[PDB]
Structure formats: structure tokens, C-alpha cells
Amino acid sequence: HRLDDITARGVLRVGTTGDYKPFSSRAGNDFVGLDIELAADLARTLGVPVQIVPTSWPTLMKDFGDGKFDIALGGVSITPERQKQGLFSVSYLRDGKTPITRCENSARFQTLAQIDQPGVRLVVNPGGTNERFARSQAPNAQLTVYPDNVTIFDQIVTGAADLMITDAIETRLQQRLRPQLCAVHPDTPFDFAEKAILLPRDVAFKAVVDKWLQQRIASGAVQRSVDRWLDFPWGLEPLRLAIDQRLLLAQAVARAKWNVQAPIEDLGREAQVIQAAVKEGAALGLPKVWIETVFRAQIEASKTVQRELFAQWSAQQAGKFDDAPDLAKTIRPELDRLTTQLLRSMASNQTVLNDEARKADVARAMRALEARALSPQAATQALAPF
Ligand SMILES: O=C(O)[C@@H]1C[C@]2(C(=O)O)C=C[C@@H](O)[C@@H](C2)O1
Numbered sequence: 087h088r089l090d091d092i093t094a095r096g097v098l099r100v101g102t103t104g105d106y107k108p109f110s111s112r113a114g115n116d117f118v119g120l121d122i123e124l125a126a127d128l129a130r131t132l133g134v135p136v137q138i139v140p141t142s143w144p145t146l147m148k149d150f151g152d153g154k155f156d157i158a159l160g161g162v163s164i165t166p167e168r169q170k171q172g173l174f175s176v177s178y179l180r181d182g183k184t185p186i187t188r189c190e191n192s193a194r195f196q197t198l199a200q201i202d203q204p205g206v207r208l209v210v211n212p213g214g215t216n217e218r219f220a221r222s223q224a225p226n227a228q229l230t231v232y233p234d235n236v237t238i239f240d241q242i243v244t245g246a247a248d249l250m251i252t253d254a255i256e257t258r259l260q261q262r263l264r265p266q267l268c269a270v271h272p273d274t275p276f277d278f279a280e281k282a283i284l285l286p287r288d289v290a291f292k293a294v295v296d297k298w299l300q301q302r303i304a305s306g307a308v309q310r311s312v313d314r315w316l317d318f319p320w321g322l323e324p325l326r327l328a329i330d331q332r333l334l335l336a337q338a339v340a341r342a343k344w345n346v347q348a349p350i351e352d353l354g355r356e357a358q359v360i361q362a363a364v365k366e367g368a369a370l371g372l373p374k375v376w377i378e379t380v381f382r383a384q385i386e387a388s389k390t391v392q393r394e395l396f397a398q399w400s401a402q403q404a405g406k407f408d409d410a411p412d413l414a415k416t417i418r419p420e421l422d423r424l425t426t427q428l429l430r431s432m433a434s435n436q437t438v439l440n441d442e443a444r445k446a447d448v449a450r451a452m453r454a455l456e457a458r459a460l461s462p463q464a465a466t467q468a469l470a471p472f
């Protein structure tokens with residue numbers, strides 16, 4: 087050999103699902119997380135760039151068999167099924183199986199006796215140790231199984247489910263991200279699982295990986311990384327997404343303006359925009375100066391997109407577009423919705439955004455905008471206030 091093939095191809099290909107913070111999370115076309123760092127470190131060690139190849143729990147083992155990637159990670163537990171189709175590295179994290187519940191329900195689910203009752207709505211992700219644990223150790227509970235992380239935690243906050251039993255490190259993170267939730271005794275779990283890297287059936291390759299991984303464990307680098315990634319400002323994702331979507335919508339603004347011969351810059355509608363933003367943002371307890379800086383940057387980024395598209399259409403001598411939505415009617419509602427999302431997310435994240443020491447993490451969290459492909463200058467101006 088596998089090493090031979092990786093050398094000859096010039097890339098380490100790494101399968102991951104990118105929906106399991108803090109191991110592996112997709113921000114745009116970017117992946118970030120503890121397992122992403124590990125992959126990039128192993129690649130560097132092997133003398134090649136890394137390529138992250140997205141996959142999903144249902145196609146994980148198939149994609150692996152189809153040769154879509156060399157190794158797989160992303161908070162992958164050692165299970166017997168996965169063992170039958172490859173080798174695992176040595177484990178780099180031993181983690182507990184423990185509950186996360188609405189905080190007011192914490193005392194109701196501290197024992198497996200309480201949990202394993204006919205009344206209990208237990209949700210879990212499919213195909214791994216959590217589902218095996220739930221079916222085995224809480225069979226008297228009503229069990230539902232979901233492929234999407236967001237859905238499980240939303241279900242628990244919103245009262246559609248009662249608890250999840252999952253890795254302790256997830257309970258720790260989600261307790262922070264979803265303040266209505268509490269991990270239940272995560273340091274003293276019901277059982278343990280081992281996180282490892284899924285490797286091909288190549289004993290020599292495994293020896294190289296194991297040698298590298300054990301050095302990183304012994305040196306404290308893995309523990310250091312776990313701690314940083316658990317502390318990472320994952321709650322910035324809605325703010326990144328609102329910025330990115332607002333900016334991508336400027337393509338539609340530009341199409342509509344081109345058709346009716348409207349100037350790009352409209353300092354009147356700009357005043358209305360900043361004014362409504364300052365009003366709503368002030369009700370959220372955000373300082374007016376924060377708000378004005380951020381939205382002035384968003385408006386300028388938008389015009390930069392518009393001007394670049396007009397510049398292309400001018401040279402190409404483009405006519406009218408039939409794929410052009412109504413500006414005042416349907417685009418500006420969307421813009422207003424995204425403005426609200428951006429303000430609410432700023433408010434949720436105000437401590438992180440106020441901490442100079444976090445700038446590097448904030449950069450990592452926010453820099454991956456799809457809109458960059460559309461305009462690198464616009465992307466930089468949108469992110470400049472942060
Ligand atoms: O006319 C427009 O609608 C768009 C949107 C914009 C904004 O992003 O809010 C507001 C006013 C205009 O100057 C620019 C930026 O074009």
C-alpha cells in the first residue's frame with residue numbers, strides 16, 4: 087504494498103463522513119477536526135499531500151472496498167464488521183458510552199435501570215457501537231436511528247427524543263454547543279469504545295502507521311490535539327454559512343440588475359439595511375459599532391461580486407437572463423432572513439468573537455467560503471471584520 091501505491095500515486099486518500107465534530111466536520115469544501123489533522127500529519131510523514139474523500143456511513147465500507155480511499159477515519163470505532171474488511175491502527179482514543187439529556191432530565195437518566203424502560207425515547211446513530219449498545223443494554227426502550235448528527239441533537243433539545251447514549255467526548259462538546267443539554271457522568275461511563283484508523287489488509291503498512299501514531303500518543307500530541315479540537319469554536323458554523331449564502335445570493339442580485347439596467351451601488355437601500363441591522367442587533371445586545379462594521383463589509387463584498395459579474399457580462403456582450411429572480415420581491419426577503427441569521431449567530435458567538443487570542447481558530451472556522459471560488463476579493467472583504 088500500500089505504501090508503494092501511495093508513493094506512486096503521490097497522495098494519501100482518506101475517507102471520512104465529515105459530520106462528527108470534533109473528529110471530522112465539513113465546512114464548505116473544507117474539512118477540519120482532530121482526525122483531519124491526524125490525516126494531514128500522517129501524509130506529511132509519508133511525503134505526500136493528503137486528499138480528504140467524503141463518504142457516508144452506508145457506503146463507508148463499500149467505498150473502502152471500491153478503492154475510493156486508502157484509509158478511513160472520523161471518530162471511527164473498532165467494530166467486528168469493520169475488522170472483517172480491513173485492519174485497524176492502534177487506538178488513539180478510548181472513550182466512554184454515556185448519556186446526554188436535557189439538563190433538567192439529568193437525574194432521570196443516570197442509571198441503566200432508569201434508561202431501559204418502556205417509556206424512554208432513545209435515539210442513536212446507525213451501524214456502530216452506539217446502536218449495538220442501545221439494542222443490547224436498553225432493549226425495553228423505544229429506539230430510533232438517524233444518519234444525521236444535527237437531527238439527533240435537535241430532537242433531544244426540542245423534546246422529540248429523550249436522550250442519546252454516545253461517546254463521552256461528543257456529550258462534552260454537545261453540552262457546550264447546545265446549552266439546554268448536559269452530559270451525564272462522562273468520566274464514569276457504562277462501557278468504553280476505541281477510536282482508530284481503518285487501514286487496508288497490509289501488515290507492513292499497519293506497522294508504519296502504528297509507529298507514527300504511538301510516537302504522537304507518547305509525546306502528548308494526540309492529547310493536545312483532542313483538547314484544542316474540543317475547545318474549537320464550532321458554534322461559528324451558522325455565522326460562516328450566513329455570510330457565505332448572503333454573498334452567493336449577490337449572483338442573483340446581479341442578474342436581476344443587469345436586466346433592468348440598475349446601478350450596482352444604491353447607498354439608499356444600504357442605509358435601510360444598516361439601520362434595520364443595527365436595530366435588530368441592538369435588541370440582541372450587540373454593540374452598534376460591531377454591527378455597522380460587519381454589515382458595511384457584507385454590502386461591499388456583495389458589490390464586489392456584482393461588479394465582477396457585470397465586468398464579465400460587459401466583455402462577453404451578454405444579453406438578458408431568463409434565470410433571473412425578482413429582486414425586490416424574492417431576493418431581498420432572503421437577504422433579510424440571512425441578515426437575521428448573521429446577527430443571531432454573532433450574538434451566540436460574542437465571547438469568541440471578542441477574544442483576540444482566538445483569531446487563528448476563528449480564521450480556520452470561517453475562511454472556507456464557497457463564495458471565494460466566485461470572488462476571492464469579495465470573500466476577503468466579507469471576512470475582514472472578523
Ligand atoms: O441593491 C441591492 O439589493 C444589492 C444588495 C446590497 C446588500 O447586500 O444588502 C444593498 C444595496 C446595494 O448597494 C448592493 C448591496 O446590491
Ligand SMILES: O=C(O)C(=O)Cc1ccccc1
Pocket residue numbers: 106161162163211213214215216217235252253256
Ligand atoms: O462509531 C460508532 O460506533 C459510533 O456509534 C460513534 C458515533 C457517535 C456520534 C456520531 C457518529 C458516530
